Design a protein around this ligand. Structure first.
Ligand SMILES: *C(=O)C[C@@H]1O[C@@H](C)[C@@H](O)[C@@H](O)[C@@H]1O
Ligand SMILES: *C(=O)C[C@@H]1O[C@@H](C)[C@@H](O)[C@@H](O)[C@@H]1O
Ligand SMILES: [Ca+2]
Ligand SMILES: [Ca+2]
Ligand SMILES: [Ca+2]
Ligand SMILES: [Ca+2]
Lengths: 114, 114
């Protein structure tokens, strides 16, 4: 099934943050309305933040997260969680190798802000 | 019900990251084995990271997140979500006022690392 695609409320500010836990350099692309709005790149095996950004969901609200390592797309896992019917989380995990820990690039999207 | 308390695997490294979305300074306390392991403090209305760190779940694996503003404890919402039976997220939201957006301090715990 398709992973890493989330439908946010339109024209809403959201935060996106990426962590790295891999020997390979992780590249995270954040797509809004099917067009690249942010790109994070970095390497770390200690959960270092390779990028954090505030974006706008745009007119369609469609937000897609893509992860790649040296041009090869990573396998993604994703889910959305809503707490007390207000606080939203869009979580993405990714695997670039064989150990299947799916933390090589961890992307957290949270909204609302402010 | 009790919120902000998660049972992690024992002696396991985990990342903890806090965001701020409020006019008040957020004080986030991360407890391990009922003892304060880390304290984040900052103010932001644009989802700025007021703290990110790698900690150890300890001999019991008990991790508690506490949030307070000007000494007054905030109301917490929390849940844990596991993706592909391996990737773990512990999420915390907090409310310091009356608008009930529960993003004033957002804490995300993720494991495993590396
Ligand atoms: C090799 O590059 C694979 C890779 O890096 C390891 C340090 C570990 O994080 C593994 O999960 C990751 O896929
Ligand atoms: C005011 O101090 C309350 C406070 O700050 C606002 C800017 C908004 O973020 C609100 O949710 C927060 O509780
Ligand atoms: Ca991996
Ligand atoms: Ca890894
Ligand atoms: Ca609030
Ligand atoms: Ca707020």
């Amino acid at each position: 099934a398709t992973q890493g695609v989330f439908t946010l409320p339109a024209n809403t500010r959201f935060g996106v943050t990426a962590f790295a836990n891999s020997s390979g350099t992780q590249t995270v692309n954040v797509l809004v309305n099917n067009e690249t709005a942010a790109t994070f790149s970095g390497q770390s095996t200690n959960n270092a933040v390779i990028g954090t950004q505030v974006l706008n969901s745009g007119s369609s609200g469609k937000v897609q997260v893509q992860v790649s390592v040296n041009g090869r797309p990573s396998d993604l896992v994703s889910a959305q969680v809503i707490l007390t019917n207000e606080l939203n989380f869009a979580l993405v995990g990714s695997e670039d190798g064989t150990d299947n820990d799916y933390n090589d690039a961890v992307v957290v999207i949270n909204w609302p802000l402010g």
